[PDB]
Amino acid sequence: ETTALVCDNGSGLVKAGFAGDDAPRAVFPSIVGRPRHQKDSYVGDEAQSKRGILTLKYPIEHGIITNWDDMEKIWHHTFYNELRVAPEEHPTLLTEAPLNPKANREKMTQIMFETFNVPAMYVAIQAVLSLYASGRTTGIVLDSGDGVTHNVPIYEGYALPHAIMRLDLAGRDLTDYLMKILTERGYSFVTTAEREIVRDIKEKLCYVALDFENEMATAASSSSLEKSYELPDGQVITIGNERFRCPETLFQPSFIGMESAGIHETTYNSIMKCDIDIRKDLYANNVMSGGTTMYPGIADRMQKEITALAPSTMKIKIIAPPERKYSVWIGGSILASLSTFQQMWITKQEYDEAGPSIVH
Amino acid sequence: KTYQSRDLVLEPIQHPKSIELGMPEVDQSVLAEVAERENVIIGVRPVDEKSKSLIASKMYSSKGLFVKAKSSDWGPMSGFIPVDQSFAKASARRDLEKFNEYAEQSILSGNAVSANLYLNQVRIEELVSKYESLTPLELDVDSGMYKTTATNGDQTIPFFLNKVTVDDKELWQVHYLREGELAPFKVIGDPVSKQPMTADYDLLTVMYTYGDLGPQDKVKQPLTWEQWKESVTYEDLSPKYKARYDNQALYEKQDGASLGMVSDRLKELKDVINTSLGRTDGLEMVHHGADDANPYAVMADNFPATFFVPKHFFDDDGLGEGKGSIQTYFNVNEQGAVVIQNPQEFSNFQQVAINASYRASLNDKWNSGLDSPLFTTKRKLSHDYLDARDEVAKKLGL
Ligand SMILES: Nc1ncnc2c1ncn2[C@@H]1O[C@H](COP(=O)(O)OP(=O)(O)OP(=O)(O)O)[C@@H](O)[C@H]1O
Ligand SMILES: Nc1ncnc2c1ncn2[C@@H]1O[C@H](COP(=O)(O)OP(=O)(O)OP(=O)(O)O)C[C@H]1O
Ligand SMILES: C/C1=C/C(=O)O[C@@H]2C[C@@H](CC[C@H](C)/C=C\CC1)O[C@@](O)([C@@H]1CSC(=O)N1)C2
Ligand SMILES: [Mg+2]
Ligand SMILES: [Mn+2]
Ligand SMILES: [Mn+2]
């Protein structure tokens, strides 16, 4: 008899809204700032705004909640300041990263019921929600956010845990890489304030080259791939091969010193760890989600890379929706709004009797 | 050839009609380019046909949030803002005391001056011949002025034009009959230049791409210079904003209250619109936030609206596969402006746009006067969201 809440707890951004809505009502940074030296704490937009007078902390590292006290502040801010709701009056669906420790889901269930007294609560895997957002129950998801990247194969609503691949490289590392390679032009970006200028450069000017080698040769013989960017202070800078070298790290992690396999290799390896019978369904339903998958050309390059690894008989399809930055939230909005799904939530009565283990 | 998506069926345009717009043709072309460049859908509220040459002349500044007095759309004062609001458009004449108070407060506060109304032969000949909103000039002997009449619905108010010369500008000073005696007609002038102001370009809505949704899309309330100083951190501000931190007058003039309820995205897009238009340093046409965020929105006063869309909407299947092009279902003029004529057509336009990943910002005041509340969250859900939920329910046995 009430609207359910959806809260996607990302490493960089919290996406919150109401189940039944096509988009979140609140998108703000997952940061808590305490005075550097007139409130005791500041969350989200307010914390970033007052950067120079606060000590900012990120409570979510690689999709996993690491500071439970700071996470309580983010959740409080979400319900009371952003959504302007009474947590005790709405069942709340929260998201969790693939391979989230059993103790982590228990602790956030304990906080939802003890601290916020929610009538009911559900914990969904982010990649699984992304698949639902595209009207699918089978396929493999590449979810690349701000702190972590995952390959999650799913068969009829259920993720296959043995074939889940975690990659500790995501948008934040690409911004640090963009700051590093921008030094190779004589440019300097060092501060936390400057890191946000490089994050804007990356989002506006970066792209994935279909053929990296040919693109590096084109950039070396001509200025056709160059772009100008006006900094806040009015100074205009030129960006050349850094436009495609920054997201190339997703395909060649050795660029950031990582001995890991690229996103295309981990996708193929994940499909190979699954039953041969369902592999066709995974190759044809490869769904891309998260902000780090937003680069123009990432789906064409994925198509080219997977095609090279897979059998020539195999038909490969890359599904990259334009709203794929919000696929995890949309998926949770779809699931929690299906009133036939009501018989799958952990109620407060179920929690009071069994304790935080009920979530498993 | 038909746009069909869930409960939305649009038949193609049969015999397209020419809609007379007040926005000058080069300004529509600029806004069509701004829409493609920025990848946003820009909607602009109506501008009366007779304001076109005034805006096109680039001579005048336009009215911001501090000049709430309405412009006129009849008589010699067409396109200008009369101090006596019984000479303005019908909306202003509805609550005459409110708009008369508005006119005075803007002048008495120093946000505008009381200026004389002068018209050249070109404007006189345009109002008599082109628009037929003024009757021919007839000499009134024992006065030396040319008597002309205009229509105020069931009223025919006379006006007397006196031939005068200012800075070697051979012009007609407009005069009216104030309480029996022959008085000079006053219009609201710019506080610095002292010249009459024209109507502004009011953003109806700005639909941004879903993939670009973020903190910049939060509508913010006007902060005082003191509330804003504590809100920001000096070093992170660009020199444009550091100037406002160190100049209470500059912040009060280019930001704060003058913008109204606005998102950070719209504050920046306003500057892109104004720069692209060559309307700068007092000549700006966009002064504030969108009708999206206007508590005092009157839906009646929002049509016909000109919408500027990213160029892909014009392609053979710009609205999606099998969907077609935007010109097929909505009127698109030579300049690229999608002319939306009423709330129903606006509701349909917004649905097609939402379906193509462009986010709407819905004002509840838009639903006032409507038979059904078209502009609500539920009514405007994405058809890709509804279709995905239907598929997921069918697949998961829900
Ligand atoms: N257009 C874009 N192009 C490239 N990167 C982008 C773009 N838009 C956003 N990003 C990046 O995506 C990240 C935020 O996306 P997202 O919402 O998926 O992360 P998250 O949910 O907070 O993180 P995580 O899933 O790792 O816990 C940031 O690193 C941001 O710089
Ligand atoms: N985002 C906003 N926040 C607050 N007020 C706003 C916003 N957008 C519009 N307004 C309000 O709406 C008004 C816009 O109308 P205005 O431009 O003054 O008149 P109009 O009906 O367009 O006629 P004119 O032809 O300009 O005289 C001004 C202000 O009261
Ligand atoms: C607009 C926006 C985008 C974003 O992705 O922001 C998130 C959250 C943000 C938190 C700190 C920052 C100072 C505050 C606000 C920026 C929020 O950190 C990020 O920018 C990190 C660090 S640089 C990068 O690419 N990701 C990602
Ligand atoms: Mg995420
Ligand atoms: Mn106006
Ligand atoms: Mn206005």
Residue numbers in the entry:
A (entry chain A): 4 to 40, 49 to 371
B (entry chain B): 466 to 863
Pull verbatim passages from the article behind this deposition:
ExoY virulence factors are members of a family of bacterial nucleotidyl cyclases (NCs) that are activated by specific eukaryotic cofactors and overproduce cyclic purine and pyrimidine nucleotides in host cells. Here, we explore the Vibrio nigripulchritudo Multifunctional-Autoprocessing Repeats-in-ToXin (MARTX) ExoY effector domain (Vn-ExoY) as a model for ExoY-type members that interact with monomeric (G-actin) instead of filamentous (F-actin) actin. While Pa-ExoY requires actin filaments (F-actin) for maximal activation, Vn-ExoY is selectively activated by G-actin in vitro. The catalytic domain of NC toxins can be divided into subdomains CA and CB, with the catalytic site located in a groove at their interface.
In the structure of Vn-ExoY bound to actin and 3’dATP, the electronic density and coordination geometry suggest that 3’dATP is coordinated by two Mg2+ ions. To unambiguously distinguish metal ions from water, we replaced Mg2+ with Mn2+ ions and collected an anomalous data set at the manganese absorption edge. The anomalous difference Fourier map confirms that two Mn2+ ions are bound to 3’dATP at the positions occupied by the Mg2+ ions, with no significant changes elsewhere. (B) The model-phased anomalous difference Fourier map from data collected at 6.55 keV, shown as a green mesh contoured at 5.0 σ, confirms the presence of two Mn2+ (grey spheres) bound to 3’dATP in Vn-ExoY NBP. In the active site of Vn-ExoY bound to actin, 3’dATP and 2 Mg2+ or 2 Mn2+, the K533VnE-LID side chain is too distant to potentially coordinate the ATP 3’OH moiety if the latter were present.
